[PDB]
């Protein structure tokens, strides 16, 4: 016994202690605490069956025990929800000795299940009597601490939670002590210290329960520490999913774009809360906030009930950021007119944000007007588009996209307009701007005699800050392919050009397998290499990938007429004619 109880003090040689106790039964099983010390070892190995097997032998004999063998009986009955037996064991423990603490605190936790039912007997009889018979008991100190938290006594919780921390030495108890001091200073907004308490609470005993993990994760919202918030909140879902633990990962949305590790879980939480309603308000906002990459109709539906949800709690006008974005959705839909109405009422609601230069409704109106001018371009109301664009540029000339959509509008008229000059001054205001810089050479695509000169005007932002630029390097491939179909291939010149375009296409192949204009380029150059049976297959791939590429319609029918498959070709020619572009495209009928 001396060496077996020596083992439990140090947390090791525990099966050795059980063996030396079982050495007692094979030398002298003449009294029960010889085998009850086996059962506490079994209990601490989470074997409550092996505990209670020896624990049946306690109460049949009941040696001289003021220490209440029935106390541990009830605690095993606390395990695996044998509660009614736990109550009866703690009761008879109190009848043998009401002075003992374990029975009263056991029933205190036992009635911690019902707080709204039987509050007072938990608070005073179940707890304050345990505080009376021992004011140094870190259980009852922790429980009066969390009661005082819920009773909003934030003073004496910090009187006695420190002692509840120091008087205990096991990790989970001092984890709960740090956690409770952390929740105390959290609602007291002393978050720097309470953060440390949350981290210590997690670090002491982690597998116990997940509230310290939640405390750290929400504490990482303080001080911008939110990277570990996601990692720590993952264990909350590893604990068990709840409505609570959706919104933390939803609002803490490191999912920006093409990042499914935060985005698929965002989808799961969003359809964890969409069916729910724990006073859902913004739940549809962060629904649609990821839906803009995805299906647009889901975003529409989210905004639809989101428009409603701002009206019932108070008849509050929808903020114009919502209304601008739903008009932006309808822009890529057929709902162009009510998209315009959305932008109008967006600008009005921004005007109704009369005093909100913190939120900068003026800047929101700037981008809203940008969207509305882009819409007027879709109306082909280029007059009012000019008006809105020059209104913004006369008030924010630092902006570039309005500066070049104007240029694009005159590009529709032609190249050497102020189209080309707005484009060049967009580089003058911002030479770092890759979109405008690409559009510079896009102008030069009109001048194909400026073919070999485009190496320089597509080299300027081949600086590696801009690299990798798939769009530009495919433009290099395209200006390199227009070099072909010349009588100099036999002179190995266009063969070198074919292989150089092939090298560009291999490069864009390796850096992107899923580009389709690339594969169109490979198939085109090998078709120029005379491999047309080797071309319809590679074009078939981009054909299922997306039919809505005007080029591949032509290039497939070129193969068809190369097998003289006219009755497969001209139909797909006029299928290419089903776009609203030009009633007689010339090269297509050629």
């Amino acid at each position: 016994l001396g060496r077996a109880c020596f083992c439990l003090l140090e947390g090791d040689k525990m099966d050795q202690a059980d063996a030396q106790f079982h050495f007692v039964l094979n030398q002298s099983p003449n009294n029960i605490p010889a085998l009850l010390g086996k059962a506490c070892i079994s209990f601490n190995k989470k074997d409550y069956r092996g505990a209670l097997a020896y624990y049946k032998k306690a109460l049949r004999t009941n040696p001289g025990c003021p220490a209440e063998v029935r106390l541990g009986m009830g605690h095993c009955f606390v395990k695996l929800n044998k509660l009614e037996k736990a109550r009866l064991a703690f009761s008879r423990a109190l009848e043998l000795n009401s002075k003992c603490v374990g029975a009263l605190v056991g029933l205190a936790v036992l009635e911690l299940n019902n707080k709204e039912a039987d509050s007072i007997k938990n608070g005073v009889q179940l707890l304050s009597r345990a505080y009376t018979i021992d004011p140094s008991n870190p259980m009852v100190l922790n429980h009066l601490a969390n009661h005082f938290f819920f009773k909003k006594d934030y003073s004496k919780v910090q009187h006695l939670a420190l002692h509840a921390f120091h008087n205990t030495e096991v990790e989970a108890m001092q984890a709960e002590s740090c956690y409770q001091l952390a929740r105390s200073f959290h609602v007291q907004e002393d978050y720097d210290q309470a953060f440390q308490y949350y981290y210590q609470a997690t670090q002491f005993a982690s597998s116990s329960f997940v509230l310290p993990f939640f405390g750290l994760g929400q504490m990482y919202i303080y001080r911008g520490d939110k990277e570990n918030a996601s990692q720590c909140f993952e264990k909350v879902l590893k604990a068990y999913p709840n409505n609570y633990e959706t919104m933390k990962i939803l609002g803490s949305l490191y999912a920006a774009s093409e990042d499914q590790e935060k985005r698929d879980i965002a989808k799961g939480h969003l359809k964890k809360v969409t069916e729910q309603y724990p006073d859902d308000v913004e739940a549809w906002i962060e629904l649609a906030q990821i839906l803009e990459q995805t299906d647009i109709q889901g975003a529409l539906s989210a905004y639809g009930t989101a428009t409603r949800i701002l009206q019932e709690k108070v008849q509050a006008d929808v903020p114009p950021e919502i209304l601008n974005n739903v008009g932006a959705l309808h822009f890529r839909l057929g709902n162009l007119g009510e998209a315009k109405k959305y932008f109008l009422a967006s600008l009005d609601r921004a005007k109704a944000e009369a005093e909100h230069d913190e939120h900068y409704y003026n800047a929101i109106s700037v981008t809203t007007s940008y969207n509305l001018a882009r819409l007027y371009e879709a109306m082909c109301e280029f007059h009012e588009a000019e008006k809105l664009y020059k209104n913004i540029l006369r008030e924010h000339p630092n902006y570039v996209d309005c500066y070049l959509r104007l240029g694009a509008m005159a590009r529709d008229k032609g190249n050497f307009y102020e189209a080309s000059d707005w484009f060049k001054e967009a580089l003058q205001i911002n030479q770092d701007h890759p979109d405008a810089w690409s559009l510079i050479g896009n102008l030069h695509l009109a001048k194909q005699e400026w073919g070999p000169g485009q190496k320089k005007f597509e080299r300027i932002l081949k600086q590696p800050s801009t690299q990798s630029d798939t769009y530009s390097m495919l433009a290099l491939g395209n200006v390199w392919l227009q070099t072909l179909h010349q009588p100099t291939r036999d002179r190995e010149k266009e063969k070198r050009h074919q292989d150089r375009a092939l090298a560009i296409y291999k490069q864009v192949l390796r850096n992107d397998a899923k580009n389709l204009y690339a594969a169109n380029g490979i198939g085109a150059v090998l078709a120029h290499k005379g491999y047309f049976r080797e071309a319809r297959d590679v074009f078939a791939q981009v054909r299922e990938a997306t039919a809505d590429i005007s080029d591949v319609w032509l290039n497939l029918a070129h193969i068809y007429v190369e097998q003289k498959q006219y009755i497969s070709a001209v139909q797909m020619y006029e299928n290419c004619l089903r776009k609203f572009y030009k009633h007689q495209n010339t090269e297509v009928v050629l």
């Binding site: 605690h75 609602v187 504490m219």
Partner: protein
């Protein structure tokens, strides 16, 4: 984007997730009893033995 409040604070509260937790009793790692074969100076095994009705219904494992 929407200007979301930074939710650095709990007011719902998590109390549904909190009081659902039933709290362990680990005051003494051998389950709140001094384990001793010397302090039983007394024994009820002598005449007469004592066994309350609550004590018989705790002598069962699960018989309800």
């Amino acid at each position: 984007t929407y200007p979301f409040d930074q939710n650095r604070f709990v007011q719902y509260k998590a109390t549904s997730l909190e009081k659902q937790h039933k709290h362990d009793l680990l005051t003494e790692p051998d389950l709140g009893v001094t384990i001793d074969l010397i302090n039983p100076d007394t024994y009820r095994i002598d005449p007469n033995v004592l066994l309350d009705p609550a004590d018989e219904k705790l002598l069962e494992e699960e018989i309800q």
